[PDB]
Amino acid sequence: EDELYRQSLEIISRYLREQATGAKDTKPMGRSGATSRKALETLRRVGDGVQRNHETAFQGMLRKLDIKNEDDVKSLSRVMIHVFSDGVTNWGRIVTLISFGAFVAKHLKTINQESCIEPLAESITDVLVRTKRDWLVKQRGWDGFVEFFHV
Ligand SMILES: CC(C)(C)c1ccc(CN2CCN(S(=O)(=O)Nc3ccc(SCCc4ccccc4)cc3C(=O)O)CC2)cc1
User: Where is this motif: BH3?
Assistant: First the structure.
């Protein structure tokens, strides 16, 4: 409920922030073997591969959306809201969305819009949690994500 949004926000905000700045957080999210720390380490491995694989489509979509400020993020979130609430729900579709978020975050860092990374992460979290709540809960939350992408 409140915890599923708070946990997802902590993982996504930290992943987007460290991808843009290019530096991992010196202060951990929790204890050594916590669900959130494991999900973030999985995101660093999986999410980075998604970005290089989907590079051309990610660069295309970014250029078409034309994100330059916070209002652009808030307004074009309605585009994301509608496209994501329709279609098959899976971990591959979930990880590609977060990877696009990190791709956008990296772009925002270059145009001196580092303040946009947090409301950007809030938009991704609110879509994922609100539209796909039942699925995520039945899939053991972020543990299901860790289990799904194991090496
Ligand atoms: C917070 C902001 C930055 C505003 C923001 C976030 C995220 C998005 C959308 N976000 C969806 C999920 N993907 S994806 O996982 O790569 N898979 C897809 C990629 C393309 C499409 S076609 C409609 C997208 C479109 C519409 C109009 C212009 C440019 C693109 C569908 C999917 C899918 O699976 O439904 C990434 C794109 C938009 C806007």
Answer: 39-53
Resolution in angstrom units: 2.9
Report the nearest-CA residue for atom 13 of ligand 1.
97
Domains located in the chain, CATH noted: 1-149 (1.10.437.10)
Helix-then-strand count for the chain, H and E: 9, 0
Decide: 73 in ligand 1 pocket, CB within 6 A: yes
CA 41, CA 47: separation in Å to the nearest integer?
10
Does the beta carbon of 96 lie inside 6 Å of ligand 1? yes
Q: Shortest CA distance to 17 belongs to which of 87, 136, 108?
A: 108
